[PDB]
């Protein structure tokens, strides 16, 4: 396994392979982090998070 097939290409959420290199993205309400892999919530109550 390579790129996206390897641990989601290290992405927090969406992993796509473009030009044979991982590109990560995030659902709406998240911003891709500086490292280009992690997803950061813009507000309170981002989608898909349990509210504990």
């Amino acid at each position: 396994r390579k790129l996206c097939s390897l641990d989601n290409g290290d992405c927090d959420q969406f992993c796509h392979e473009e030009q044979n290199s991982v590109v990560c993205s995030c659902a709406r309400g998240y911003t891709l982090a500086d490292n280009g892999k992690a997803c950061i919530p813009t507000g309170p109550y981002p989608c898909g998070k349990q509210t504990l």
């Binding site: 989601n8 796509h16 989608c47």
Partner: protein, 230 residues
């Protein structure tokens, strides 16, 4: 839900409940954003007029009631086979997110198929029956359900499993969704984020041996859902 565990504080915040004129739950839905609920099309036939309740875990102790402004049903749904069993509800007033009220994420199609639907399990939830012949549950419940190989699922089914559907649950172990859970959330967890992956659709009873729960395959309607919202 038959089997499974109770949803604890803030564990199933995207759960929506469809209530008839008598404040009785008949179907679930999934919160997609402040104005939009996802549910099953077949649910739209089980009541003349209805409202949407969110933030509720115990239907006895007080939660926020929302009214429906627009009901957007998939034109190709047929009561005959339950294909295209999907609808989106736009509300009159925006949902206020808070503890226990929050939206589930919508994934991208390719990633969802290769990464979400290939996980071992998903989670279905709702206020439906705890036994096939029982009454509606007053507590919100959740249940971890394994993805079922597509081949096995078809072989197990007395009816046709189209490409807009998938199977989840257990061959014999007695846990399944059930009456009242329809329209509700099937979500799949990835690194602590939950994505909508299914809509509780139908089953040959509840928890019956050699049968599975049948869900509307959300990945097949992603664009439709986006268009429904925009």
């Amino acid at each position: 839900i038959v089997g499974g565990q109770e949803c604890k504080d803030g564990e199933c915040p995207w759960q929506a409940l469809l209530i008839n004129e008598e404040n009785e739950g008949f179907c679930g839905g999934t919160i997609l954003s402040e104005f939009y609920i996802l549910t099953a099309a077949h649910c739209l036939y089980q009541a003349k007029r209805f409202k949407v309740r969110v933030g509720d875990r115990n239907t006895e102790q007080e939660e926020a009631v929302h009214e429906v402004e627009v009901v957007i049903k998939h034109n190709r749904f047929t009561k005959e086979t339950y294909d295209f069993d999907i609808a989106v509800l736009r509300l009159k007033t925006p949902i206020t997110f808070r503890m226990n009220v929050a939206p589930a994420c919508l994934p991208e199609r390719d990633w969802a198929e290769s990464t979400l639907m290939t996980q071992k399990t998903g989670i279905v939830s709702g206020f439906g029956r705890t036994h096939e012949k029982g009454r509606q549950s007053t507590r919100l419940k959740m249940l971890e359900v394994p993805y079922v190989d597509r081949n096995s699922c078809k072989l197990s089914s007395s009816f046709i499993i189209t490409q807009n559907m998938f199977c989840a649950g257990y061959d014999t172990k007695q846990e399944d969704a059930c009456q009242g859970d329809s329209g509700g959330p099937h979500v799949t967890r990835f690194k602590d984020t939950y994505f909508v992956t299914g809509i509780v659709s139908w089953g040959e009873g509840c928890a019956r041996k050699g049968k599975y729960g049948i869900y509307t395959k959300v990945t097949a309607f992603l664009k439709w859902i986006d268009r429904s919202m925009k």
